[PDB]
C-alpha cells in the first residue's frame, strides 16, 4: 500500500542513517514532503529516546541476543506484545522505531548490515498491517509530525 511504502521510506532511512551515520540523499516518493518532516522529527525525538534509555535498551538487546537475520523476527514479536493491551499512541510507536534504530546500530557494529533493511521492513509491516486504521484516523505521518512539534 501507499502507507506501507511511505512508512518504509521513513523507517528504513532512519534506521540506516542511525546505523551508518550517512544520510540517504536519494529522492523520496510522492509523499516526500511529509516523509522529510517525519524523518526530521525522528532525528529529534528518536535520538532522544535512545540516549535517555540507553542503559535499558542495552539490556533488552543483550537479552534478545541478535546475531543474524533469523533473529530480526524477535523485534516484530516485541511490537506485537507492546500493542497487546489494546493501547496505541505515538509515544509507543516512536519508542519502537527508536529501539529499532538501536538494534540497527548493533547490526552494523557486528557486521550484519545486510539485516537492517529486513528489520526496517519487519517493523513497518507490524505497524501498517496491524495499526492501519489507527494510523489513518490519526492522519498518518502528518499527524506524527504535528504531535511531536514544539512551539
Amino acid at each position: 500500500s501507499e502507507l506501507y511504502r511511505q512508512s518504509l521510506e521513513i523507517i528504513s532511512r532512519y534506521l540506516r542513517e542511525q546505523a551508518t551515520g550517512a544520510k540517504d540523499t536519494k529522492p523520496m516518493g510522492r509523499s516526500g514532503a511529509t516523509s522529510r518532516k517525519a524523518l526530521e522529527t525522528l532525528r529529534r525525538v528518536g535520538d532522544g529516546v535512545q540516549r535517555n534509555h540507553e542503559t535499558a535498551f542495552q539490556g533488552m538487546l543483550r537479552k534478545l541476543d541478535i546475531k543474524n537475520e533469523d533473529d530480526v523476527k524477535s523485534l516484530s514479536r516485541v511490537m506485537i506484545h507492546v500493542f497487546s493491551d489494546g493501547v496505541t499512541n505515538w509515544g509507543r510507536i516512536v519508542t519502537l522505531i527508536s529501539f529499532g534504530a538501536f538494534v540497527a546500530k548493533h547490526l552494523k557494529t557486528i557486521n550484519q548490515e545486510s539485516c537492517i533493511e529486513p528489520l526496517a521492513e519487519s517493523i513497518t509491516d507490524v505497524l501498517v498491517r496491524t495499526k492501519r486504521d489507527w494510523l489513518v484516523k490519526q492522519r498518518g505521518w502528518d499527524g506524527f509530525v504535528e504531535f511531536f512539534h514544539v512551539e
Binding site: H81, V82, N89, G91, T95, F147
Partner: peptide, 22 residues
C-alpha cells in the same frame, strides 16, 4: 516468549511516559 514479553512491557511504559509528556 517470556523475555520478549518483559521487554515489551518496559518499552510500553517508556512509550506511554513519553506520550504523557506530549
Amino acid at each position: 516468549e517470556d523475555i520478549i514479553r518483559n521487554i515489551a512491557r518496559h518499552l510500553a511504559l517508556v512509550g506511554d511516559l513519553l506520550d504523557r509528556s506530549i
